[PDB]
């Protein structure tokens, strides 16, 4: 096999139900899944998971993307994580059929509001009471109940009367009564224990902090040097923030995908322009949950995933996934359901955080994610997804687009085992993925970066062809198609006598993946 | 460059197809030019008014796709020279392959007939209410008059009852049978009129037992094979065994000749399904049906038969009483414009003109007018619904050609393509596309001359005959054929630089299936 | 049973086909029709048909509306026709189950350009012909009574003569004479009709004579007016003005007879109560390759608006001399029905031909056969999707009635209506089941015939003191009419529309009711 996630046996000839309701009634928990796991698994690599050995096991169990969290660590430390990721990835390269591309993602620390120290270190903040938030440094090393300092100079500009301010990522709540001439005076809504350099969130305030801190500028230039596939850009509030990130990555980093993290109210409010400007979106439920009423976050998640699905842009669901698996070898029922529901809402990828970065069971976390994501696939109602996305786009006439919608249509009609797409940039495979076929998309490419970036898209299984370009265009095609047939047979996607859809250009160095073939598997 | 006037059919590809049939009707505009090409085939009967090489050339230029020969009259030698003139006219355009329009030759048999005897030519006046005795007794063959009538159908009596109608001379004279003898009938003249010598008889509702193929038809079918006709229109088909008989006589030499069954009576309508299964296509002969069946049911029979043909993906031709007024006038009635148009809208693949082109005074104007009406009727077809219904009825399979043909039609609607280009040897791939009824014209590129001619049986196929030799690189042989079809479509005004067309081909030489679809911008 | 059109037996639990194509595929010429005849029949009354005896037989054979052509005849002559129509109609009053309302239609003469008098001269094609106003008939000289042709004709105009049989081409005017050349040839008799292309005709839409005819119609209590030569909204407004206050309930049906009417159709429709498509007149200016489009477009727009549309002219012409129609005529009629026409009108066939009775019965036969080919599922689905999104209770109620009628395979939708409004709303959505509109207003009953699928019945019973008893009595009358006509039987289901509580007028109440 070469890993517990390698073989994902499909059955192609099930009756598709005429209604969503019937699709639900037919679910059967005693039935093994009969579909591939189509959602991407992103794991945060840190102290628990950064050894070459653990990483190999994680790749086997279904990790597609390694996330590096630049909130902590030096460049040296993260360069050594990346090197171990690439060693573990390349250890499977000897067998091109069993090689799984693994992407590297750099997640920036991003703009932050921090308190100043207690004196340096705890203080008890009293339900009711008053607290003055002060702003000049002559009060930074001394806090306690009376006063509190923080580094965001413009708080007073962006806060109004009755605004919430949260301290220590949600713990302490505050209610601003008056803006007191470059000061703030606050009623303690919640109250708890207060420490030093604790994070501050401003629900519904249009924070004025730069798109990119100087620390992020240096971390993004390191990402370019280190050849990363994508960046997760923090606290994105407007289209300009994205353009700034893109400016920093410049010409050398132009092929690096920018995933915008939506972590506050302004980001949700300005989502359309953020989406316009971005390559993808990450929904940070934890951070949204501080910034926005608890009970609206599920609305915000569903909206963002629907809009991304409509634009054909990758969306990653993040934070609070299998967080209990930091300390235990199984997740709760509720975690299972939350993960499942993100896949069912239409997420392309699910990201694991502390569960893989620093906890006691990184391996089991990956495996459990793969199990849940794969079981969720039974409850996806493919017909409706495809029918609605088809119905919700213009004429276009872009040959590659027209051919993508056709391949997906053909995949349903023929109950195909796969859609094989030959692609240099990945674009055709991405265009196929936005129409949400049931069949796996086998994206055959010679470009190693294309192959790694393809993991951002639901349903793309990237395979990296290492064979040189054959002279005769038609036999170069048959060779890449052959490689795909062999992977798909080996992963149990299909077998002899099944049918697959094949997408290609026509003749060498053509503009457009504009050629669709329906091909029996030999 | 226009050597036609049916040749240039300028299409406008970029308007939204309405979301309802009702809205499509509401948006019809008599003041704007048609934006579609003329997709139904035109079949013209060639006779004294049309058989010269010169008239035939202009008939091709005006839209004629198929030359019909009516073997009801004329000798083998008369019909052989007609066929020769059709081919001389057709081949006069071969010098420019872009202007060349394939033209098919169809042979329409006389078929089985019931005929009366002689009036000792002389006529006698039959009067309503009077009694007429019909006798089989041949001692009377030559002495028909106002009291006794001899017919040559020796089984009439087996097949008729008291109450039964008998029509004579194309429905002019009606008799109801009042007493049923063994060798004879006695009947009340219901209608009345002047009865001539050797006139045709119809038995409405009677399961007529004459042979599928007369002695004269066997001779005519063998001549068809020798003359390399493209199709036969077989008369008075009543049941599956009738079609098998025709197929047996055409035999192995005639195996590629298409058999179109003419439905001309009640039994044919009733046994339509078995006839359709056995036939290559169907011709609805409304005039004949009008005698054989209550006049006011014929429109139901037509709609029914055209529907079943569309469902089966088999050509259906509507014939008789099309632009008949144009035998003597240079313009048709409003009613005829409407009846032709409604046969197009019913789903007809082709329309056939008869005396209008065979013997009338304005053969050329009948062709021109048929083309005008058919092209305007196109605006009124709601293409989207036909396709969606045919897609949803089709038996579900994973067969690659069919998935590809359906996909190609789907893409043609979604990209508003200017054409579907299909490279086809036998024509099958192009026929598979046509049966899904795209709005866009199908340009079927073939090197097979016969394939090119027979393609006209299907609505929407514009066949072009590629003359170039087979290139050594398959990919180059494809682009050569595709380029040719591009040149043709540009010249006919189907599309232009910037537009998109759908292209269907195989994948490598021979292989098996036309399983490749490309969405190609027009260079 | 009194008459050949009375019993229209139905079978209800069909299963409608999933596609239009399957619907066509399942047509079967040997099966008797299993639906009522839903299309209205309008007959022109004239010398052959104006006797009480003939009118009675015509009613029994399916005539729903009697058209009076005021192109000819005096007020005295028409008053007597109307009196005969009403005598014949009221002869059936004595059994209310058997009583069929019959409407009277007044068709205006309108403006008419007409030639003079000399035998037939053959205008051989190409050969001169000058027109004169000087109050003589060969290839040079022809006179006509439109004093302003010269003012309205500019070198290159066309002049049609005798119902488009001839077409002359002016290309030199002389402000009193015109010098034409024959463009289309034919034989030319005496005292003919003439037309000009586009909007050239400036003659008033309502003439002094039309004003007198329309006021006559008001005093004779006619149900509808067929307004000739309507070319724009303001022609409709002038007719409505003349009919005025007293004639406010008279339906105005604008006749579309020329290219200009087609061009300005949207405003004519808006301003009219309905439309008549005069195919023959259309075919004078408009070529044969376009007339069928105009017909389909106009019937389509009428259907979308919910306004009655009548197909007229060249229907069963051959039946003027023959007792049977041709195949082509049968098809032409059937195709008007399938196009969505609410009524079909007979002209010379009933007015002056030898077989008035047979032309009616044969119209009925064809219209009833055409019903099998109508795909009611799609009509309703589409008209539902294209209706403006209102909350109007009467509209929601009508749509719900039709939907319940399909779901329940109901034998009928029974509508209790003083004004007919609710029955008209239901007919717009094209149910398969017949609409039995129960009314005590005789005008409502008569005007109902303009709408496809309405069977109007006139309740003669007095109002019951208890409202629910008054409702049950009218519904019971409807059940009886429907059983006698064979629409349904005991054990079937019907849809019933009413108001809630006495003397409303607002029909917002739907019930699903077993046939007892």
PDB file of N, CA, C and O in Angstrom, chain A residues 13 390 395-397 399 402-403 405 409 413-415 473-475 477-478 499 504 506-507 512 514-520, chain B residues 391 396-398 400 402-404 406 410 413-416 474-476 478-479 500 507-508 513 515-521:
ATOM      1  N   UNK A  13     -20.794   2.665  -9.341  1.00  0.00           N
ATOM      2  CA  UNK A  13     -22.150   2.403  -9.786  1.00  0.00           C
ATOM      3  C   UNK A  13     -23.085   2.274  -8.575  1.00  0.00           C
ATOM      4  O   UNK A  13     -23.614   1.201  -8.273  1.00  0.00           O
ATOM      5  N   UNK A 390     -23.157  25.013 -12.108  1.00  0.00           N
ATOM      6  CA  UNK A 390     -23.388  25.162 -13.552  1.00  0.00           C
ATOM      7  C   UNK A 390     -24.382  26.304 -13.796  1.00  0.00           C
ATOM      8  O   UNK A 390     -24.094  27.247 -14.505  1.00  0.00           O
ATOM      9  N   UNK A 395     -21.940  32.665 -19.822  1.00  0.00           N
ATOM     10  CA  UNK A 395     -21.644  31.911 -21.066  1.00  0.00           C
ATOM     11  C   UNK A 395     -20.143  31.568 -21.101  1.00  0.00           C
ATOM     12  O   UNK A 395     -19.775  30.422 -21.381  1.00  0.00           O
ATOM     13  N   UNK A 396     -19.305  32.574 -20.799  1.00  0.00           N
ATOM     14  CA  UNK A 396     -17.822  32.544 -20.905  1.00  0.00           C
ATOM     15  C   UNK A 396     -17.396  32.286 -22.361  1.00  0.00           C
ATOM     16  O   UNK A 396     -17.145  33.239 -23.101  1.00  0.00           O
ATOM     17  N   UNK A 397     -17.306  31.001 -22.741  1.00  0.00           N
ATOM     18  CA  UNK A 397     -16.778  30.523 -24.034  1.00  0.00           C
ATOM     19  C   UNK A 397     -15.257  30.294 -23.965  1.00  0.00           C
ATOM     20  O   UNK A 397     -14.669  29.802 -24.929  1.00  0.00           O
ATOM     21  N   UNK A 399     -12.431  28.285 -23.840  1.00  0.00           N
ATOM     22  CA  UNK A 399     -12.375  26.855 -24.147  1.00  0.00           C
ATOM     23  C   UNK A 399     -12.113  25.938 -22.937  1.00  0.00           C
ATOM     24  O   UNK A 399     -12.740  24.900 -22.839  1.00  0.00           O
ATOM     25  N   UNK A 402     -15.314  25.835 -20.661  1.00  0.00           N
ATOM     26  CA  UNK A 402     -16.385  25.062 -21.323  1.00  0.00           C
ATOM     27  C   UNK A 402     -16.076  23.567 -21.231  1.00  0.00           C
ATOM     28  O   UNK A 402     -16.962  22.768 -20.970  1.00  0.00           O
ATOM     29  N   UNK A 403     -14.803  23.222 -21.431  1.00  0.00           N
ATOM     30  CA  UNK A 403     -14.332  21.836 -21.397  1.00  0.00           C
ATOM     31  C   UNK A 403     -14.344  21.241 -19.974  1.00  0.00           C
ATOM     32  O   UNK A 403     -14.572  20.051 -19.817  1.00  0.00           O
ATOM     33  N   UNK A 405     -16.580  22.149 -17.494  1.00  0.00           N
ATOM     34  CA  UNK A 405     -17.990  21.838 -17.166  1.00  0.00           C
ATOM     35  C   UNK A 405     -18.412  20.542 -17.865  1.00  0.00           C
ATOM     36  O   UNK A 405     -19.135  19.755 -17.265  1.00  0.00           O
ATOM     37  N   UNK A 409     -19.775  16.900 -16.254  1.00  0.00           N
ATOM     38  CA  UNK A 409     -21.056  16.382 -16.768  1.00  0.00           C
ATOM     39  C   UNK A 409     -20.858  14.930 -17.206  1.00  0.00           C
ATOM     40  O   UNK A 409     -21.548  14.036 -16.737  1.00  0.00           O
ATOM     41  N   UNK A 413     -22.499  11.243 -16.052  1.00  0.00           N
ATOM     42  CA  UNK A 413     -23.265  10.458 -17.033  1.00  0.00           C
ATOM     43  C   UNK A 413     -22.646   9.074 -17.227  1.00  0.00           C
ATOM     44  O   UNK A 413     -23.374   8.100 -17.323  1.00  0.00           O
ATOM     45  N   UNK A 414     -21.312   9.010 -17.260  1.00  0.00           N
ATOM     46  CA  UNK A 414     -20.554   7.783 -17.517  1.00  0.00           C
ATOM     47  C   UNK A 414     -20.178   7.052 -16.229  1.00  0.00           C
ATOM     48  O   UNK A 414     -19.553   6.025 -16.326  1.00  0.00           O
ATOM     49  N   UNK A 415     -20.544   7.588 -15.056  1.00  0.00           N
ATOM     50  CA  UNK A 415     -20.107   7.042 -13.731  1.00  0.00           C
ATOM     51  C   UNK A 415     -18.589   6.796 -13.746  1.00  0.00           C
ATOM     52  O   UNK A 415     -18.118   5.702 -13.389  1.00  0.00           O
ATOM     53  N   UNK A 473       3.781  14.583 -29.576  1.00  0.00           N
ATOM     54  CA  UNK A 473       2.843  15.146 -28.609  1.00  0.00           C
ATOM     55  C   UNK A 473       1.818  14.096 -28.162  1.00  0.00           C
ATOM     56  O   UNK A 473       1.530  14.010 -26.972  1.00  0.00           O
ATOM     57  N   UNK A 474       1.308  13.305 -29.115  1.00  0.00           N
ATOM     58  CA  UNK A 474       0.274  12.301 -28.860  1.00  0.00           C
ATOM     59  C   UNK A 474       0.761  11.186 -27.915  1.00  0.00           C
ATOM     60  O   UNK A 474      -0.050  10.608 -27.168  1.00  0.00           O
ATOM     61  N   UNK A 475       2.049  10.831 -27.985  1.00  0.00           N
ATOM     62  CA  UNK A 475       2.567   9.726 -27.183  1.00  0.00           C
ATOM     63  C   UNK A 475       3.077  10.263 -25.849  1.00  0.00           C
ATOM     64  O   UNK A 475       3.254   9.468 -24.920  1.00  0.00           O
ATOM     65  N   UNK A 477       1.162  12.391 -24.362  1.00  0.00           N
ATOM     66  CA  UNK A 477      -0.157  12.411 -23.771  1.00  0.00           C
ATOM     67  C   UNK A 477      -0.488  11.000 -23.273  1.00  0.00           C
ATOM     68  O   UNK A 477      -0.849  10.818 -22.095  1.00  0.00           O
ATOM     69  N   UNK A 478      -0.313  10.006 -24.148  1.00  0.00           N
ATOM     70  CA  UNK A 478      -0.603   8.617 -23.778  1.00  0.00           C
ATOM     71  C   UNK A 478       0.269   8.190 -22.588  1.00  0.00           C
ATOM     72  O   UNK A 478      -0.170   7.405 -21.770  1.00  0.00           O
ATOM     73  N   UNK A 499     -14.482   3.537 -16.942  1.00  0.00           N
ATOM     74  CA  UNK A 499     -14.316   4.642 -17.883  1.00  0.00           C
ATOM     75  C   UNK A 499     -13.769   5.835 -17.099  1.00  0.00           C
ATOM     76  O   UNK A 499     -14.109   6.008 -15.926  1.00  0.00           O
ATOM     77  N   UNK A 504      -6.915  17.384 -21.918  1.00  0.00           N
ATOM     78  CA  UNK A 504      -5.608  17.700 -22.514  1.00  0.00           C
ATOM     79  C   UNK A 504      -5.727  18.979 -23.338  1.00  0.00           C
ATOM     80  O   UNK A 504      -6.853  19.528 -23.593  1.00  0.00           O
ATOM     81  N   UNK A 506      -4.663  20.425 -27.247  1.00  0.00           N
ATOM     82  CA  UNK A 506      -4.547  19.829 -28.557  1.00  0.00           C
ATOM     83  C   UNK A 506      -3.265  20.335 -29.231  1.00  0.00           C
ATOM     84  O   UNK A 506      -3.174  21.538 -29.502  1.00  0.00           O
ATOM     85  N   UNK A 507      -2.358  19.389 -29.516  1.00  0.00           N
ATOM     86  CA  UNK A 507      -0.992  19.582 -30.090  1.00  0.00           C
ATOM     87  C   UNK A 507      -0.127  20.431 -29.154  1.00  0.00           C
ATOM     88  O   UNK A 507      -0.633  21.034 -28.205  1.00  0.00           O
ATOM     89  N   UNK A 512      -4.825  26.533 -23.954  1.00  0.00           N
ATOM     90  CA  UNK A 512      -6.152  25.960 -23.595  1.00  0.00           C
ATOM     91  C   UNK A 512      -6.042  24.436 -23.393  1.00  0.00           C
ATOM     92  O   UNK A 512      -5.561  23.741 -24.253  1.00  0.00           O
ATOM     93  N   UNK A 514      -8.470  22.184 -23.827  1.00  0.00           N
ATOM     94  CA  UNK A 514      -9.727  22.343 -24.540  1.00  0.00           C
ATOM     95  C   UNK A 514     -10.201  21.026 -25.188  1.00  0.00           C
ATOM     96  O   UNK A 514     -11.187  21.060 -25.939  1.00  0.00           O
ATOM     97  N   UNK A 515      -9.552  19.898 -24.857  1.00  0.00           N
ATOM     98  CA  UNK A 515      -9.760  18.581 -25.435  1.00  0.00           C
ATOM     99  C   UNK A 515     -10.205  17.592 -24.346  1.00  0.00           C
ATOM    100  O   UNK A 515      -9.508  17.413 -23.327  1.00  0.00           O
ATOM    101  N   UNK A 516     -11.363  16.948 -24.578  1.00  0.00           N
ATOM    102  CA  UNK A 516     -11.993  16.010 -23.666  1.00  0.00           C
ATOM    103  C   UNK A 516     -12.201  14.684 -24.389  1.00  0.00           C
ATOM    104  O   UNK A 516     -12.803  14.643 -25.464  1.00  0.00           O
ATOM    105  N   UNK A 517     -11.751  13.616 -23.749  1.00  0.00           N
ATOM    106  CA  UNK A 517     -11.875  12.288 -24.248  1.00  0.00           C
ATOM    107  C   UNK A 517     -12.522  11.413 -23.185  1.00  0.00           C
ATOM    108  O   UNK A 517     -12.204  11.529 -22.000  1.00  0.00           O
ATOM    109  N   UNK A 518     -13.415  10.533 -23.629  1.00  0.00           N
ATOM    110  CA  UNK A 518     -13.967   9.479 -22.777  1.00  0.00           C
ATOM    111  C   UNK A 518     -13.259   8.179 -23.143  1.00  0.00           C
ATOM    112  O   UNK A 518     -13.334   7.750 -24.291  1.00  0.00           O
ATOM    113  N   UNK A 519     -12.595   7.568 -22.153  1.00  0.00           N
ATOM    114  CA  UNK A 519     -11.577   6.563 -22.399  1.00  0.00           C
ATOM    115  C   UNK A 519     -11.826   5.382 -21.474  1.00  0.00           C
ATOM    116  O   UNK A 519     -11.899   5.545 -20.257  1.00  0.00           O
ATOM    117  N   UNK A 520     -11.948   4.149 -22.023  1.00  0.00           N
ATOM    118  CA  UNK A 520     -12.036   2.950 -21.185  1.00  0.00           C
ATOM    119  C   UNK A 520     -10.690   2.731 -20.476  1.00  0.00           C
ATOM    120  O   UNK A 520      -9.657   3.096 -21.014  1.00  0.00           O
TER     121      UNK A 520
ATOM    122  N   UNK B 391     -32.226  14.190 -24.029  1.00  0.00           N
ATOM    123  CA  UNK B 391     -31.162  13.829 -23.103  1.00  0.00           C
ATOM    124  C   UNK B 391     -31.741  12.982 -21.972  1.00  0.00           C
ATOM    125  O   UNK B 391     -31.137  12.000 -21.571  1.00  0.00           O
ATOM    126  N   UNK B 396     -29.581   5.107 -20.297  1.00  0.00           N
ATOM    127  CA  UNK B 396     -28.333   5.499 -19.628  1.00  0.00           C
ATOM    128  C   UNK B 396     -27.303   4.382 -19.856  1.00  0.00           C
ATOM    129  O   UNK B 396     -27.568   3.219 -19.548  1.00  0.00           O
ATOM    130  N   UNK B 397     -26.164   4.761 -20.456  1.00  0.00           N
ATOM    131  CA  UNK B 397     -24.998   3.892 -20.705  1.00  0.00           C
ATOM    132  C   UNK B 397     -23.722   4.721 -20.501  1.00  0.00           C
ATOM    133  O   UNK B 397     -23.770   5.950 -20.389  1.00  0.00           O
ATOM    134  N   UNK B 398     -22.584   4.023 -20.442  1.00  0.00           N
ATOM    135  CA  UNK B 398     -21.258   4.640 -20.335  1.00  0.00           C
ATOM    136  C   UNK B 398     -20.547   4.600 -21.696  1.00  0.00           C
ATOM    137  O   UNK B 398     -19.318   4.760 -21.755  1.00  0.00           O
ATOM    138  N   UNK B 400     -18.791   5.533 -24.923  1.00  0.00           N
ATOM    139  CA  UNK B 400     -18.048   6.786 -25.088  1.00  0.00           C
ATOM    140  C   UNK B 400     -18.533   7.729 -26.207  1.00  0.00           C
ATOM    141  O   UNK B 400     -18.451   8.965 -26.046  1.00  0.00           O
ATOM    142  N   UNK B 402     -21.553   8.176 -27.397  1.00  0.00           N
ATOM    143  CA  UNK B 402     -22.817   8.777 -27.081  1.00  0.00           C
ATOM    144  C   UNK B 402     -22.597   9.869 -26.038  1.00  0.00           C
ATOM    145  O   UNK B 402     -23.185  10.950 -26.128  1.00  0.00           O
ATOM    146  N   UNK B 403     -21.753   9.577 -25.045  1.00  0.00           N
ATOM    147  CA  UNK B 403     -21.421  10.571 -24.010  1.00  0.00           C
ATOM    148  C   UNK B 403     -20.809  11.801 -24.674  1.00  0.00           C
ATOM    149  O   UNK B 403     -21.102  12.922 -24.293  1.00  0.00           O
ATOM    150  N   UNK B 404     -19.984  11.549 -25.697  1.00  0.00           N
ATOM    151  CA  UNK B 404     -19.288  12.569 -26.426  1.00  0.00           C
ATOM    152  C   UNK B 404     -20.267  13.367 -27.286  1.00  0.00           C
ATOM    153  O   UNK B 404     -20.182  14.565 -27.309  1.00  0.00           O
ATOM    154  N   UNK B 406     -23.552  13.775 -26.842  1.00  0.00           N
ATOM    155  CA  UNK B 406     -24.400  14.576 -25.941  1.00  0.00           C
ATOM    156  C   UNK B 406     -23.607  15.776 -25.387  1.00  0.00           C
ATOM    157  O   UNK B 406     -24.114  16.905 -25.325  1.00  0.00           O
ATOM    158  N   UNK B 410     -24.339  19.819 -25.697  1.00  0.00           N
ATOM    159  CA  UNK B 410     -24.407  20.613 -24.462  1.00  0.00           C
ATOM    160  C   UNK B 410     -23.458  21.807 -24.555  1.00  0.00           C
ATOM    161  O   UNK B 410     -23.853  22.956 -24.259  1.00  0.00           O
ATOM    162  N   UNK B 413     -24.642  24.681 -26.876  1.00  0.00           N
ATOM    163  CA  UNK B 413     -25.615  25.610 -26.279  1.00  0.00           C
ATOM    164  C   UNK B 413     -24.919  26.554 -25.278  1.00  0.00           C
ATOM    165  O   UNK B 413     -25.245  27.728 -25.194  1.00  0.00           O
ATOM    166  N   UNK B 414     -23.976  26.020 -24.507  1.00  0.00           N
ATOM    167  CA  UNK B 414     -23.379  26.762 -23.400  1.00  0.00           C
ATOM    168  C   UNK B 414     -22.322  27.751 -23.919  1.00  0.00           C
ATOM    169  O   UNK B 414     -22.176  28.818 -23.332  1.00  0.00           O
ATOM    170  N   UNK B 415     -21.617  27.438 -25.020  1.00  0.00           N
ATOM    171  CA  UNK B 415     -20.676  28.407 -25.620  1.00  0.00           C
ATOM    172  C   UNK B 415     -21.308  29.195 -26.768  1.00  0.00           C
ATOM    173  O   UNK B 415     -20.596  29.939 -27.419  1.00  0.00           O
ATOM    174  N   UNK B 416     -22.598  28.977 -27.047  1.00  0.00           N
ATOM    175  CA  UNK B 416     -23.259  29.554 -28.210  1.00  0.00           C
ATOM    176  C   UNK B 416     -22.374  29.345 -29.439  1.00  0.00           C
ATOM    177  O   UNK B 416     -22.075  30.282 -30.126  1.00  0.00           O
ATOM    178  N   UNK B 474      -1.686  11.773 -38.390  1.00  0.00           N
ATOM    179  CA  UNK B 474      -3.093  11.788 -38.073  1.00  0.00           C
ATOM    180  C   UNK B 474      -3.494  13.194 -37.575  1.00  0.00           C
ATOM    181  O   UNK B 474      -4.470  13.747 -38.014  1.00  0.00           O
ATOM    182  N   UNK B 475      -2.678  13.804 -36.707  1.00  0.00           N
ATOM    183  CA  UNK B 475      -2.973  15.111 -36.174  1.00  0.00           C
ATOM    184  C   UNK B 475      -3.038  16.155 -37.299  1.00  0.00           C
ATOM    185  O   UNK B 475      -3.881  17.082 -37.243  1.00  0.00           O
ATOM    186  N   UNK B 476      -2.151  16.032 -38.293  1.00  0.00           N
ATOM    187  CA  UNK B 476      -2.211  16.896 -39.467  1.00  0.00           C
ATOM    188  C   UNK B 476      -3.437  16.535 -40.326  1.00  0.00           C
ATOM    189  O   UNK B 476      -4.021  17.410 -40.960  1.00  0.00           O
ATOM    190  N   UNK B 478      -6.325  15.548 -39.259  1.00  0.00           N
ATOM    191  CA  UNK B 478      -7.437  16.136 -38.567  1.00  0.00           C
ATOM    192  C   UNK B 478      -7.468  17.634 -38.860  1.00  0.00           C
ATOM    193  O   UNK B 478      -8.530  18.122 -39.304  1.00  0.00           O
ATOM    194  N   UNK B 479      -6.338  18.357 -38.651  1.00  0.00           N
ATOM    195  CA  UNK B 479      -6.361  19.828 -38.751  1.00  0.00           C
ATOM    196  C   UNK B 479      -6.729  20.238 -40.181  1.00  0.00           C
ATOM    197  O   UNK B 479      -7.406  21.263 -40.394  1.00  0.00           O
ATOM    198  N   UNK B 500     -16.626  30.539 -31.439  1.00  0.00           N
ATOM    199  CA  UNK B 500     -16.141  29.227 -31.026  1.00  0.00           C
ATOM    200  C   UNK B 500     -16.996  28.150 -31.721  1.00  0.00           C
ATOM    201  O   UNK B 500     -18.199  28.352 -31.972  1.00  0.00           O
ATOM    202  N   UNK B 507      -9.337   9.762 -31.693  1.00  0.00           N
ATOM    203  CA  UNK B 507      -8.127  10.152 -30.976  1.00  0.00           C
ATOM    204  C   UNK B 507      -6.838   9.788 -31.743  1.00  0.00           C
ATOM    205  O   UNK B 507      -5.873  10.567 -31.758  1.00  0.00           O
ATOM    206  N   UNK B 508      -6.784   8.620 -32.370  1.00  0.00           N
ATOM    207  CA  UNK B 508      -5.613   8.261 -33.189  1.00  0.00           C
ATOM    208  C   UNK B 508      -6.125   7.430 -34.359  1.00  0.00           C
ATOM    209  O   UNK B 508      -7.287   7.030 -34.354  1.00  0.00           O
ATOM    210  N   UNK B 513     -13.740   4.808 -31.908  1.00  0.00           N
ATOM    211  CA  UNK B 513     -14.851   5.680 -31.500  1.00  0.00           C
ATOM    212  C   UNK B 513     -14.542   7.145 -31.848  1.00  0.00           C
ATOM    213  O   UNK B 513     -13.397   7.545 -31.825  1.00  0.00           O
ATOM    214  N   UNK B 515     -14.555   9.835 -29.910  1.00  0.00           N
ATOM    215  CA  UNK B 515     -14.636   9.976 -28.477  1.00  0.00           C
ATOM    216  C   UNK B 515     -13.907  11.237 -28.008  1.00  0.00           C
ATOM    217  O   UNK B 515     -13.739  11.407 -26.780  1.00  0.00           O
ATOM    218  N   UNK B 516     -13.483  12.096 -28.948  1.00  0.00           N
ATOM    219  CA  UNK B 516     -12.780  13.325 -28.619  1.00  0.00           C
ATOM    220  C   UNK B 516     -13.610  14.568 -28.974  1.00  0.00           C
ATOM    221  O   UNK B 516     -14.025  14.778 -30.114  1.00  0.00           O
ATOM    222  N   UNK B 517     -13.746  15.464 -27.999  1.00  0.00           N
ATOM    223  CA  UNK B 517     -14.414  16.706 -28.207  1.00  0.00           C
ATOM    224  C   UNK B 517     -13.471  17.850 -27.855  1.00  0.00           C
ATOM    225  O   UNK B 517     -12.947  17.903 -26.718  1.00  0.00           O
ATOM    226  N   UNK B 518     -13.392  18.823 -28.756  1.00  0.00           N
ATOM    227  CA  UNK B 518     -12.613  20.018 -28.542  1.00  0.00           C
ATOM    228  C   UNK B 518     -13.504  21.249 -28.670  1.00  0.00           C
ATOM    229  O   UNK B 518     -14.357  21.313 -29.562  1.00  0.00           O
ATOM    230  N   UNK B 519     -13.229  22.262 -27.844  1.00  0.00           N
ATOM    231  CA  UNK B 519     -13.840  23.579 -27.974  1.00  0.00           C
ATOM    232  C   UNK B 519     -12.787  24.493 -28.612  1.00  0.00           C
ATOM    233  O   UNK B 519     -11.784  24.816 -27.988  1.00  0.00           O
ATOM    234  N   UNK B 520     -13.021  24.892 -29.868  1.00  0.00           N
ATOM    235  CA  UNK B 520     -12.024  25.510 -30.706  1.00  0.00           C
ATOM    236  C   UNK B 520     -12.446  26.927 -31.072  1.00  0.00           C
ATOM    237  O   UNK B 520     -13.479  27.156 -31.705  1.00  0.00           O
ATOM    238  N   UNK B 521     -11.616  27.943 -30.756  1.00  0.00           N
ATOM    239  CA  UNK B 521     -11.886  29.293 -31.230  1.00  0.00           C
ATOM    240  C   UNK B 521     -11.706  29.289 -32.754  1.00  0.00           C
ATOM    241  O   UNK B 521     -10.796  28.629 -33.259  1.00  0.00           O
TER     242      UNK B 521
END
